[PDB]
Amino acid sequence: IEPFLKTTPRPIRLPDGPPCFQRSKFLLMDALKLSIEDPSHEGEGIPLYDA
Amino acid sequence: IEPFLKTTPRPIRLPDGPPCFQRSKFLLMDALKLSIEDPSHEGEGIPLYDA
């Protein structure tokens, strides 16, 4: 055994190399949405036509 | 000539026979309308689907 001392754990070094790049299937902050402006309640829609 | 006197013109006699019957292409007082409840302004509709 050893004393897992206060000053012992060094800061974990992150890898270095090229910059990290996004891989999400859909962007998250920069996206925006073209509203429909509140259709009726009985009118169902096959989604293409609403789009 | 003759004097078209005040008392001369008898009341025109309407014909007599069976009762008069409607022939309009669409009834007029008794009809009613199933509303759509105010759709949007951009959504055009081929009329069957609105009906």
mmCIF file of C-alpha atoms in Angstrom:
data_model
loop_
_atom_site.group_PDB
_atom_site.id
_atom_site.type_symbol
_atom_site.label_atom_id
_atom_site.label_comp_id
_atom_site.label_asym_id
_atom_site.label_seq_id
_atom_site.Cartn_x
_atom_site.Cartn_y
_atom_site.Cartn_z
ATOM 1 C CA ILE A 1 0.000 0.000 0.000
ATOM 2 C CA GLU A 2 0.940 3.654 -0.327
ATOM 3 C CA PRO A 3 -0.551 6.974 0.793
ATOM 4 C CA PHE A 4 -2.631 8.351 -2.073
ATOM 5 C CA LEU A 5 -1.473 11.779 -1.096
ATOM 6 C CA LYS A 6 -3.163 15.110 -1.707
ATOM 7 C CA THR A 7 -0.469 16.380 -4.095
ATOM 8 C CA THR A 8 0.035 13.007 -5.795
ATOM 9 C CA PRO A 9 -2.595 12.960 -8.579
ATOM 10 C CA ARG A 10 -1.175 15.037 -11.409
ATOM 11 C CA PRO A 11 -3.593 16.741 -13.803
ATOM 12 C CA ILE A 12 -4.589 14.201 -16.412
ATOM 13 C CA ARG A 13 -3.044 15.308 -19.683
ATOM 14 C CA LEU A 14 -5.511 15.481 -22.521
ATOM 15 C CA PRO A 15 -4.234 14.112 -25.840
ATOM 16 C CA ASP A 16 -2.757 16.553 -28.330
ATOM 17 C CA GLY A 17 -3.172 16.582 -32.074
ATOM 18 C CA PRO A 18 -5.638 18.183 -34.483
ATOM 19 C CA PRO A 19 -8.686 20.006 -33.101
ATOM 20 C CA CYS A 20 -11.756 18.065 -32.038
ATOM 21 C CA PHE A 21 -14.546 18.022 -34.633
ATOM 22 C CA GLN A 22 -18.292 17.548 -34.322
ATOM 23 C CA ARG A 23 -19.932 14.288 -35.384
ATOM 24 C CA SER A 24 -23.536 14.695 -34.268
ATOM 25 C CA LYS A 25 -26.205 13.476 -36.635
ATOM 26 C CA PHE A 26 -27.832 16.898 -36.444
ATOM 27 C CA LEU A 27 -26.404 20.192 -35.298
ATOM 28 C CA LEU A 28 -27.636 21.455 -32.017
ATOM 29 C CA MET A 29 -27.187 25.187 -31.351
ATOM 30 C CA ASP A 30 -27.063 26.732 -34.804
ATOM 31 C CA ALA A 31 -30.149 25.027 -36.223
ATOM 32 C CA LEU A 32 -33.470 26.802 -36.615
ATOM 33 C CA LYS A 33 -37.033 25.753 -37.344
ATOM 34 C CA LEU A 34 -39.524 27.002 -39.903
ATOM 35 C CA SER A 35 -42.749 27.034 -37.923
ATOM 36 C CA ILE A 36 -46.156 26.050 -39.293
ATOM 37 C CA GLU A 37 -48.041 28.796 -37.378
ATOM 38 C CA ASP A 38 -50.435 26.687 -35.345
ATOM 39 C CA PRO A 39 -52.672 24.509 -37.562
ATOM 40 C CA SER A 40 -56.034 23.124 -36.540
ATOM 41 C CA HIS A 41 -56.580 20.189 -34.207
ATOM 42 C CA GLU A 42 -58.480 17.796 -36.502
ATOM 43 C CA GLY A 43 -56.219 18.069 -39.534
ATOM 44 C CA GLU A 44 -53.702 15.268 -39.507
ATOM 45 C CA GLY A 45 -50.752 15.599 -41.842
ATOM 46 C CA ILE A 46 -48.506 13.262 -43.730
ATOM 47 C CA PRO A 47 -45.277 14.971 -42.686
ATOM 48 C CA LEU A 48 -44.021 15.978 -46.126
ATOM 49 C CA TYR A 49 -46.926 18.348 -46.621
ATOM 50 C CA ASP A 50 -46.430 20.040 -43.262
ATOM 51 C CA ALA A 51 -42.757 20.462 -44.100
ATOM 52 C CA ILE B 1 -110.763 54.975 -74.676
ATOM 53 C CA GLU B 2 -112.299 54.273 -71.287
ATOM 54 C CA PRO B 3 -111.720 55.469 -67.718
ATOM 55 C CA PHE B 4 -109.415 52.979 -66.007
ATOM 56 C CA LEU B 5 -111.376 53.524 -62.860
ATOM 57 C CA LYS B 6 -110.266 53.060 -59.272
ATOM 58 C CA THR B 7 -112.626 50.135 -58.600
ATOM 59 C CA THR B 8 -112.132 48.561 -62.036
ATOM 60 C CA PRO B 9 -109.044 46.336 -61.611
ATOM 61 C CA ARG B 10 -110.247 43.177 -59.907
ATOM 62 C CA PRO B 11 -107.774 41.194 -57.800
ATOM 63 C CA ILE B 12 -105.816 38.970 -60.137
ATOM 64 C CA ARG B 13 -106.867 35.407 -59.415
ATOM 65 C CA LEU B 14 -103.966 33.086 -58.808
ATOM 66 C CA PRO B 15 -104.277 29.666 -60.459
ATOM 67 C CA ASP B 16 -105.670 26.808 -58.403
ATOM 68 C CA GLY B 17 -104.538 23.216 -58.358
ATOM 69 C CA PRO B 18 -101.996 21.234 -56.343
ATOM 70 C CA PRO B 19 -99.686 23.066 -53.929
ATOM 71 C CA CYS B 20 -96.573 24.801 -55.205
ATOM 72 C CA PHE B 21 -93.370 22.791 -54.740
ATOM 73 C CA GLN B 22 -89.739 23.835 -54.459
ATOM 74 C CA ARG B 23 -87.331 23.289 -57.348
ATOM 75 C CA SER B 24 -84.164 25.047 -56.215
ATOM 76 C CA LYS B 25 -80.897 23.302 -56.922
ATOM 77 C CA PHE B 26 -80.023 23.608 -53.243
ATOM 78 C CA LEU B 27 -82.249 24.274 -50.278
ATOM 79 C CA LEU B 28 -81.954 27.655 -48.738
ATOM 80 C CA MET B 29 -83.229 28.013 -45.158
ATOM 81 C CA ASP B 30 -82.961 24.518 -43.729
ATOM 82 C CA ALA B 31 -79.389 23.809 -44.815
ATOM 83 C CA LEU B 32 -76.456 23.959 -42.425
ATOM 84 C CA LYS B 33 -72.686 23.981 -42.761
ATOM 85 C CA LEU B 34 -70.024 21.876 -41.087
ATOM 86 C CA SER B 35 -67.320 24.429 -40.383
ATOM 87 C CA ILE B 36 -63.584 23.790 -40.698
ATOM 88 C CA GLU B 37 -62.673 25.872 -37.599
ATOM 89 C CA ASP B 38 -60.371 28.439 -39.156
ATOM 90 C CA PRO B 39 -57.367 26.814 -40.887
ATOM 91 C CA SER B 40 -54.073 28.532 -41.561
ATOM 92 C CA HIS B 41 -53.448 31.086 -44.289
ATOM 93 C CA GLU B 42 -50.713 29.333 -46.298
ATOM 94 C CA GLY B 43 -52.338 25.915 -46.532
ATOM 95 C CA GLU B 44 -54.232 25.620 -49.774
ATOM 96 C CA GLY B 45 -56.669 22.751 -50.074
ATOM 97 C CA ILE B 46 -58.010 20.604 -52.843
ATOM 98 C CA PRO B 47 -61.647 20.918 -51.789
ATOM 99 C CA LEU B 48 -62.366 17.250 -51.111
ATOM 100 C CA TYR B 49 -59.928 17.185 -48.221
ATOM 101 C CA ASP B 50 -61.390 20.289 -46.602
ATOM 102 C CA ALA B 51 -64.838 18.745 -46.931
#
